[PDB]
Design a protein around this ligand. Structure first.
Ligand SMILES: CC[N+](CC)(CC)Cc1ccccc1
Ligand SMILES: [Mg+2]
Ligand SMILES: [Mg+2]
Ligand SMILES: [Mg+2]
Length: 340
């Protein structure tokens, strides 16, 4: 039973879950990779990695991906979680220098990953490995777009570092802009493309219905993370959360803030249902009888299908993953799967 404050009957009824058939291999392979790259200690991998459900999250999202693509995505996603953990720990421990250096290394590695495959910081080496693999599926133009987007993400993490160090809780609109970057909206949207085997031309992926469907899928996911992760975040002195911005700047109680975030999440769902009809119409229109049109149609249709799958995968992930089980920790401020 999903807690009533977090339950969304529309997702439960109208967004049936899907699971990629590679998932059981994926679970094992990403666990092995976390170990091999030394991204988490062996005993914590053994106790916690499967329970974190990071592979499940991605296997419920990128349906139809080639197995090798899903593996690179899942390893990169598990890396991304560990990076969120490292960032958090650097802030909590006041490691401004170590964070600045990591930030610079990630920008460099993102542009030249093969050069960093054996870097002394295993977090940089693990990033480089996953990124090098992601850069092997589609043309350099897509790689450059992924890099452009992720440079922006790294800087949004840097902004979060300074917000937390200075005690600043962003305003509501400032936060909503920032959250499109810290949640990596455009990275997940970029990754739809190797998942369906096609770098989409700008004129296709920038079609207003494709853009809007892509945006709403990520806003839902990010704001639903905010709703579910709020208790762990308050316990850990995290300030980045739509609920915390509302409590801090709109004088809402916790109860009022939860309700307002819920209402925003629910509106994303029904806005998405409306634009999804337009995005699927567009997919149909691309199928103009030509070979290229059939390719583009199939790719848009698969991508929009996965924009829909993200709703259910993210919904259930928050109820299944050990990541958010703060009630089970002895020290609510220190999740047991993080390196403290
Ligand atoms: C640290 C969390 N994460 C992805 C690694 C950062 C972009 C956002 C996220 C949280 C929960 C579900 C899906 C994505
Ligand atoms: Mg976090
Ligand atoms: Mg974060
Ligand atoms: Mg969160």
């Amino acid at each position: 039973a999903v807690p009533p404050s977090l339950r969304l009957p529309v997702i439960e009824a109208a967004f049936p879950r899907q699971l990629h058939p590679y998932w059981p291999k994926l679970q094992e392979t990403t666990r092995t990779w976390l170990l091999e790259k030394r991204l988490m200690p062996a005993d914590k991998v053994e106790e916690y990695a499967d329970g974190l459900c990071y592979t499940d999250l991605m296997a419920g999202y990128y349906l139809g991906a080639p197995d090798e693509v899903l593996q690179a995505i899942a390893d990169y996603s598990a890396w991304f979680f560990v990076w969120d953990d490292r960032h958090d720990r650097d802030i909590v421990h006041g490691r401004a220098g170590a964070w600045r250096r990591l930030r610079g290394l990630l920008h460099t590695a993102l542009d030249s990953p093969g050069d960093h495959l054996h870097h002394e910081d295993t977090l940089v080496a693990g990033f480089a490995d996953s990124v090098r693999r992601l850069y092997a599926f589609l043309p350099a133009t897509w790689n450059a777009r992924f890099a452009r987007h992720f440079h922006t993400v790294i800087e949004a993490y840097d902004r979060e570092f300074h917000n937390r160090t200075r005690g600043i809780v962003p305003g509501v609109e400032e936060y909503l802009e920032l959250r499109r970057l810290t949640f990596a909206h455009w990275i997940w949207t970029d990754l739809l493309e190797p998942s369906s085997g096609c770098e989409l031309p700008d004129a296709v992926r920038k079609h207003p219905a494709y853009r809007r469907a892509a945006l709403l899928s990520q806003e839902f996911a990010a704001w639903y993370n905010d709703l579910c992760s709020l208790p762990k975040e308050i316990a850990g002195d995290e300030v980045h959360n739509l609920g915390i911005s509302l409590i801090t700047h709109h004088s809402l109680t916790l109860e009022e803030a939860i309700g307002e975030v819920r209402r925003r999440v629910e509106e994303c769902i029904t806005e998405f249902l409306a634009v999804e009809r337009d995005a699927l119409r567009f997919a149909d229109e691309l199928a103009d009888g030509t070979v290229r049109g059939k390719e583009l149609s199939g790719a848009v249709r698969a991508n929009v299908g996965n924009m829909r799958n993200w709703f259910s995968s993210v919904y259930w992930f928050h109820h299944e993953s050990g990541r958010y089980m703060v009630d089970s920790w002895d020290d609510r401020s220190t999740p047991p799967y993080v390196n403290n």
